Amino acid sequence: MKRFFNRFYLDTGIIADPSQRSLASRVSAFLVQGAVAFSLLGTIGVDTSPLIAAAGVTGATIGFACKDFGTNFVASIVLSGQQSIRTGNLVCIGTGLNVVKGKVVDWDTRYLYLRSSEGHLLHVPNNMVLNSVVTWE
Amino acid sequence: MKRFFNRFYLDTGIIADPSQRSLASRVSAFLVQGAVAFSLLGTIGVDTSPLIAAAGVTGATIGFACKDFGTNFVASIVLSGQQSIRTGNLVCIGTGLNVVKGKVVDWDTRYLYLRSSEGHLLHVPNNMVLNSVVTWE
Amino acid sequence: MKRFFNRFYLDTGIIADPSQRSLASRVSAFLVQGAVAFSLLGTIGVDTSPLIAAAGVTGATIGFACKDFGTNFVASIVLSGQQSIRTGNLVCIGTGLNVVKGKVVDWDTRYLYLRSSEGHLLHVPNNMVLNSVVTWE
Amino acid sequence: MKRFFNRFYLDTGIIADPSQRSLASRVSAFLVQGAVAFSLLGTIGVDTSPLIAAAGVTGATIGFACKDFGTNFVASIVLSGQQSIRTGNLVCIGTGLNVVKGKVVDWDTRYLYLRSSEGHLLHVPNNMVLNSVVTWE
Amino acid sequence: MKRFFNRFYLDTGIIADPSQRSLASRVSAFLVQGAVAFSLLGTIGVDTSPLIAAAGVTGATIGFACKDFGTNFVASIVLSGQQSIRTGNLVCIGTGLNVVKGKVVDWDTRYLYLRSSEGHLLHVPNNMVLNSVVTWE
Amino acid sequence: MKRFFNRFYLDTGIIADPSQRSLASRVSAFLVQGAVAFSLLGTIGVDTSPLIAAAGVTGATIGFACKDFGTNFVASIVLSGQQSIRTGNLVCIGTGLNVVKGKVVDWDTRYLYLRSSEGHLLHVPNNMVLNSVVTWE
Amino acid sequence: MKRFFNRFYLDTGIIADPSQRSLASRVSAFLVQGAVAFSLLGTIGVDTSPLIAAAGVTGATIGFACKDFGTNFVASIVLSGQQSIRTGNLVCIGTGLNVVKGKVVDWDTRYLYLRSSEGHLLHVPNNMVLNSVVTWE
């Protein structure tokens, strides 16, 4: 199932990094196999309610802890092909005092990289770029 | 079921982009078929509680990760036909220091495009336009 | 059931726009019929748990995506007959830097329209009007 | 049951407006009768799970949409008999730039009315009055 | 059970006002009796699922509406015996522009009362006092 | 079970105050005994669903009301042994206008005590210290 | 199971501190053993619903109390190998008035340590570093 999940992720373009793709495929295959095993165990008579409750609590806690990571990942997925965030573009994110200006040099799954006028590297989170006023110059 | 969902989305006007319409139709058809298959499996005696719990946890996590995307999409759906956000209109979004001014050039499902006095392109999120004071001039 | 829901909405005054009333009546009739059909299917032995879980997840996601729309609609419903927001009244919403001033020209289910001293049209969301200090002059 | 709910609301002082009291009594009687009918239907064998799920989803959505209305109503209920918010009192709500000053002229279930030095009428929400620094002069 | 709940509340010091103690005892006794009655009804065969769902929805809505009241009550309970908030003490709550200064004159279950240099009475919510920088002078 | 819970809390270092330790041990023993009694009652045939629903609603409301207290307690637990917050250290919490400066004199489970240059005592909540920029001098 | 969990945590790199690794292994082994014991008890006929409800409520309350700790831990896990946060690097976190500048001296699982121009030690939370504009110089 790992190969199937890797193929699905590669085809859909959700995940592009090979290491991240392998990790996600392993995790998804393990989760699906565990769910199938729990269903099979519950079919024959074993009470799966405590196991389901514990697994659900652990999964909810883990997903709530990784909220920012997930949000940044989704923002990076959505913003792809924006036609305004490209290499060499002079973009400006923010309005008012909280303003960020620079030239796009690289894009990541967690940060958007800009080069300032003084040569500094600016790490703008993708979630910040999503919920802000991007100014293309 | 893909054709039925595509027809429903096209008729209701919820989704207009053909690629987005096809993707949404495929996803909805797959989800409905999976729910029907799970119900059929649970009818004959298979314990579907672990599968339901896992699918619900995954769906909740995915929907919570795409919160901003969904909010922007809904805002773009609602704001359609505003009679104030039209091509060539001089609108101004915001009050105080966080102010954005320009002329509407194009509308998207994720951003509202304005042209500044200096010629810059402003990408205002639809969610920002919804919960703000739009000033038509 | 569509006619019954339309009559109920018209009598209670919750919805006034005929197009919105027809859409809401259709949606409510479809939802009630679907719930009745699911109950009937579950009576005869079909396991309705996966269908209920899927429908609940979809409904929760849709309702959470339309949070701002629902809030604005409820605010417009509540603020009706305020005796202070009337045509020709000089109202002022907000305190401090985030201040909005104008004369009320029209009311909508999504925006409150004011005319500035310079002639601009101000679109103040109803949710903003609810949770703010309205200053009648 | 409408008369019983009206008597309970009048005696407890939760609701004072006769129209609001009648509406709340009707709604509560209808809800209790519906719950009793659903329990009776489920006793004889009818699967009430889809109906319960649909009713719960609708009630949760409605209650979440009316969050601000409910909060203001509860604040108005709690603040009653404050001994500081009385007719003719010179109160001041807020600290810093977001300050509101005036003389109390009337109290409502949604707004607190103050008269400014220039004669303007200030509509301060009860929720704002609850979570703020009231300054009695 | 009303007397038992009154004794428990008085001994634990959670509630000190006799009227509030009587109201809380009545409410708790009614709730416990209702839960016992529902359990007894469900034992003999009556389907209690709709009643439980309705009661839970109503209780959740009521508890969410009284969020600020509950938070202030808990803050007043916790802050008791602070050794810094005493009669005649010159305390200062807040940092920056949102600053409040005065001498403590009285304590309530909803507000903390201070006397300003000009003689004004300041009503500082207990929740504000909890999540702020108290400056004892 | 009270002695067992007291020993566990003392060994793990979660709770250090003897009065708080005794109260927590009593509460935990009562809760565990109640859960065991409810399970035993449900084994013999008594429908425990209404009792479970009522207890869960009450516990959720209580835990949500004590959110700030719990957060401060957890922050005090985590920050222990920081090697930067010690007696006599000149620390500075905050950035910008909301800045607090002083010398650490004492630590509590609810506040962090600092002595200002003018001799005032500053009560900084532990939750504030956790989510802020501490500046050791 | 403690050794298995320790090996898993060490191999995945989620936890690096040996004391934290041992504590997490003990906690995970205890939780899994408890879930298995509850499932076994529920298989033979014992009603595990009250125990599951109590354990779930306690776990939810504990996880919600440790929200900031979990968020900081996840941020520290994610930010590892940033290639911009290294020893001796001159980084600047924040935009506007809330700005922090210094040279990285050490990294922790709860704070990021910077040395100011005046020699002060700055404790920047990892969650703050995640959701901010890092400026590498």
Numbering used by the authors:
A (entry chain D), B (entry chain E), C (entry chain F), D (entry chain G), E (entry chain A), F (entry chain B), ...: 1 to 137
Text of the article:
The 3D reconstruction reached an overall resolution of 3.21 Å with applied C7 symmetry. Alignment of the conserved β domains in these structures indicates that the arrangement of TM2 and TM3 in TcMscS is similar to that in the open EcMscS channel but differs substantially from that in the closed, suggesting that the TcMscS structure may represent an open conformation and that TcMscS adopts a membrane-embedded position closer to that of the open EcMscS channel. The structures of TcMscS in detergents and in nanodiscs are essentially identical, with an RMSD of ~ 0.3 Å for all Cα atoms.
Trypanosoma cruzi, the protozoan parasite causing Chagas disease, encodes a miniature MscS ortholog (TcMscS) critical for parasite development and infectivity.
